[PDB]
Structures are given as C-alpha cells and as structure tokens.
Amino acid sequence: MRSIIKGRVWKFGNNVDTDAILPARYLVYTKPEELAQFVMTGADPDFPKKVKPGDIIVGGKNFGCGSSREHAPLGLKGAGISCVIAESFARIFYRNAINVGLPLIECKGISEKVNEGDELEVNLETGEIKNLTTGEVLKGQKLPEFMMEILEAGGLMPYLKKKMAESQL
Template identity: 50%
Template sequence: MIRGRVWKYGKNVDTDAIYPARYLVYFEPAEVAKHAMEDIDPDFLSKAKPGDILVAETNFGTGSAREQAAMTLKFAGIGAVLADSFNRCFYRNAINNALPVLSMRGISQQIDEGDDVEIDLEHGRIIDHTSGKEFQAAPMPELLQKILAANGAIAYYRAHPAKIAEPVKSAGAACVGESCRE
C-alpha cells in the first residue's frame, strides 16, 4: 500500500533540482540517496519520511535523462510521486526503478501540503484522508504496472526473457488518458 504525508512542489521541477549534475558521477544507491531535492529543498531529506508522497504541478522531472533523479527519490524511500504531468524520460526512469508515479491533470490543486494521502495504482484511485476527498486518475497501462510489480524493468525483463512486452496490435488498446506518459 502507498500511503504517506504529502510534500508539495511547483511546476517544471527539473532534474537538476531533483539531483544536481555535480553528483552525476555517483551511482551507488547510498550516495545517490543523499542528494534528493538538494537544490530545490535543502531540508527535504531531514523532513521527509519513508513512504511520503510528492505532489507536483506540471512537467515534473523535466530536463536531463539522468536516472539518478528517479533513483534518488526511490532510494530515499519516497512512496510515490503524483503530478499534473511528468517529463517522459523521468516517467520511464521512475517505472523502471519501481518508483510509483501517477499523473492526473489538476491534482496539485486538490491536495495540500501535509495531507495524508493513499494511492491505489492498479485502479488509479487517490484518497486524501485529511480532506476526505477521492480522485480517479486513469489507471496505468498494464505493462507498466507489471514492471512496477516486478520491482523494476531489469527484474521484469529477467522474468520475461523472450520479450519485454507483447506488441499490442489492436488499435488504441494500450493507453488512455493522462496517466499514460511513456
């Protein structure tokens, strides 16, 4: 279950803000985890607890392809990121590292800093226990849910060595709505 306290951020939170370029040389999880949100919120690691949830406006993760931006949040124990929209590469990196991400237009205006929020990824349901409101996002495409459930793309691929996914040949079957940002 994903449930935690909300930390809110604005629009266009870029990868330099999430994980500054000066630490690009590091890939070890313990080191990568030390620099989460360092340039946008220097107190982040001292205040956020494992399982907490980030809620951001549009275009979260814009900027570079650096996977450390997703890894640092995962390794720092963040439970999920909700945003009005995501940068596509950050979105892929998050899924590949089993960091749950869900997008829904307008969600950042509905949830307040400090709220206690629960997320049901399979059904795209978001429950704000503080305000009592519930929101319905488009469920994540099945393939991406499988990658998350396998704890990341490498584990998923190893369990499915022939192919990462069966090509979906029927028109439009794979993706509906805002949650679908490869």
C-alpha cells in the same frame, strides 16, 4: 508490491527539473543509497532532513523536465519515496522512473486538491486518489496491468530476467 499506497505528501510546483530533484554535483554517485541523501536538494536543501521512507511527492506540470538524468528517479527510489503524483511528467523522467521501479501517477487537478502534509491514499491499479486529511477524492490515470508488472518486478531489468527465465523463443 503494494497496489494501494498511503503516505504523507511533500509538495512541489511546476516545471521542477532534474537539477531540482538531484543536483549535478551528485552525479558522481551511482548507488540509490548514496543518491537518496540528496533528493530534491536543488529545490529544498533540507529536504533529505524532512522526508521519510514511504512519503509521497506531489508535483505540478512537467515534473522531472530536462535532459536524461537517471540518477534523479534512482535517488527518489533510494530515499523510499512510495510514489510521485503530478499533473504531468517529462517523458524521459517518466520512463526512467518506471524502469527503476518508482511508481508514478498522472492526476490532473492534483495541485488544487492536495496540500503539503496531507495524508493520501493512492490506488495504483485504478488511479483513484483519496485525500485523507480533507476527505476529497480524485481520479488519476491508472497504471495498466502491464506496467504494474514491471513495477512489481522492481523495474525493467529484474522484469527482463523474469521474462527471459520464462521464454521459449
């Protein structure tokens, strides 16, 4: 589980909905490997041609808004997106993402301080964000240790297996 993430940024704006992230026509697919091929194609039909595993997505307010669509974060995960940093996240998208093991970070003002193509360093444990391209540094909201453990585990289900293997009732 890399606590500290360095990657180049793909940028998206406000109210980017689950249709932008994973179009309805791909709901036929349930595997992350399949879904990875179609990430963000609602917003940019060529996106899967540009993105590389390890890249970071930066979004505006209310990223992932819309009704539940687990395929959306599952696809980002499958594509190797290292994390998503946004001004804010829709609530359903947010929990779905943490539970599939996709790190998310809220950072007010991120939209003003990062450009598409910039290189970022993100410390998940502290929320500190460094724009390497520009030298600017920001303070996002850290992931608490409790949530780092879920992420480190790979998501909720593998998290559960570990917790149950260690129980005693």
